[PDB]
Amino acid sequence: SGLVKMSHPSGDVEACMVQVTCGSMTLNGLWLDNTVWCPRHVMCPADQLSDPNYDALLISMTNHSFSVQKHIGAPANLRVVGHAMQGTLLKLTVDVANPSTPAYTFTTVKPGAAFSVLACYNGRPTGTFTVVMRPNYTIKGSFLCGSCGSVGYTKEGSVINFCYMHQMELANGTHTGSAFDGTMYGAFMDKQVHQVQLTDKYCSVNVVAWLYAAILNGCAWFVKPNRTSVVSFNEWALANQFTEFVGTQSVDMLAVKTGVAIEQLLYAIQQLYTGFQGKQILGSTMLEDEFTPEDVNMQIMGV
Amino acid sequence: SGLVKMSHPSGDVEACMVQVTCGSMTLNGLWLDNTVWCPRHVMCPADQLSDPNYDALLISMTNHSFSVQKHIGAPANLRVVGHAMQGTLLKLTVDVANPSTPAYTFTTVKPGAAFSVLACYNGRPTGTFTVVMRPNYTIKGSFLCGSCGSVGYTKEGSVINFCYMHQMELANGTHTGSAFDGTMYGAFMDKQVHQVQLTDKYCSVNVVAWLYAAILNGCAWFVKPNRTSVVSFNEWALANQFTEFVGTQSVDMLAVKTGVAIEQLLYAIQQLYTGFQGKQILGSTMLEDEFTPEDVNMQIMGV
């Protein structure tokens, strides 16, 4: 019993972290097979950060411009024998294939989905945490200067699904990055220029999942006979900064185990949004939306 | 910027997890050099869990009663060549030294201190999370059947400090275990009988650290010229379920950076305890005590 913010074991990903240097700029890279992935802003000098031209910067670079070092495990200097740009990322080719490359895929995450982040500094892993891709395509992490190139991922069976590479900080506690196809989540620019993020929203299906977790742990004071249909809730959601509720088999499993219908929890959300009234739910005083239905199913049952 | 629940990278500890079987009982063990540590209740059958005699159980065991298996990485069966009991733990001697034993120490954690937990099932790591040792010597984790033997630890430089081995669940979301010297935190018994835990307390130095994190994020409505000395606060704390405040260099660093004195935040705690005045602090309407000063310093300032 109990519900905590849980991350995937980070061992397989730690073995892929490397340091990438270009001029006087240093950040983290991901070493898979003979390829090192890193943010392309490593090529940008301080005096050009106010308005950079990445196509011009790439042309000016040679294999000599990049230095790749592995610090963890058996340390090694990797020879860069090729360089290329894919969207907002650099794809460096090195002469040694990573002997600890896990079985992996590249996947893009959708808003409301959770993933683990391995935070790194100078190619060294320092911490791990779980985040949810926000409806405004940002993440609320903990990243300081030098954390760029830190990676986000999930684990499915024995396969690591790499979904995020840390790029920038937009505002206090608000971060964004790219998918491994080179596209930045939310189409933000990888430049130190003015850019406003859209309004964030509460992830409705995650709040329902968290309320089911509370019921399964003996906390059900907020459950009443009252119900709100998913059609009525979704119209209400549009005007109250909540995402559209879309049901799934994982949510249905939680409804059948507890005997509490989804519609009863949509009504509870509308009431709890106007105040918890000094009461707690799982040690929280405001709605929690960073626990997915799959997360609750895993932490509460074998499912 | 941003404050999240952060764990240590779990790779070094994952390489030490093994499965220990004794009869029809199975749980997790920790493999360091030629030693495997596991909870001693692996020797206890289901019908004897209410009133066990561990000294009699140990005598009845032979090296062949224990089966040790490594599942992740390069799998191996380890042959048990010695067995011993140290408090609430078994110390098995195996014929192969773990080739990935990290540099380590055994340390007992004090209430208010944070540590990372690597949750395991059948010798397989499944997740990682951070907890604080509660003033009543329990932890609020997320553990299901089969998680016994999961380990807690901190990292100082390159040294892993193993501080906890999961033993039992006392109540919903309330867990306890032992230190690697064999002593159970809070002197709870490793047996199936009803045991009452003492009342919890708010960890004062952690609430001060969280109020400093709020000021660093632009939230300082609770800061007034009013001050409470640490001597006055500690007398008040005794009667109001708060731990004794003990200052540290990390708290002093937060006071210098923000320009807000410790004594102003001790007064603020006494006022916020009587109500949050219809406002919120970092997304909460109740005091938060699971972020330590070191945690706030490392995540906000990187020191």
Swiss-Prot record, chains A, B:
Residues 1-303 form the Peptidase C30 domain. The active site is at 41 (for 3cl-pro activity), 148 (for 3cl-pro activity). It catalyses: TSAVLQ-|-SGFRK-NH2 and SGVTFQ-|-GKFKK the two peptides corresponding to the two self-cleavage sites of the SARS 3C-like proteinase are the two most reactive peptide substrates. The enzyme exhibits a strong preference for substrates containing Gln at P1 position and Leu at P2 position. Cleaves the C-terminus of replicase polyprotein at 11 sites. Recognizes substrates containing the core sequence [ILMVF]-Q-|-[SGACN]. Also able to bind an ADP-ribose-1''-phosphate (ADRP). This is 3C-like proteinase nsp5. The lineage of its organism: Viruses, Riboviria, Orthornavirae, Pisuviricota, Pisoniviricetes.
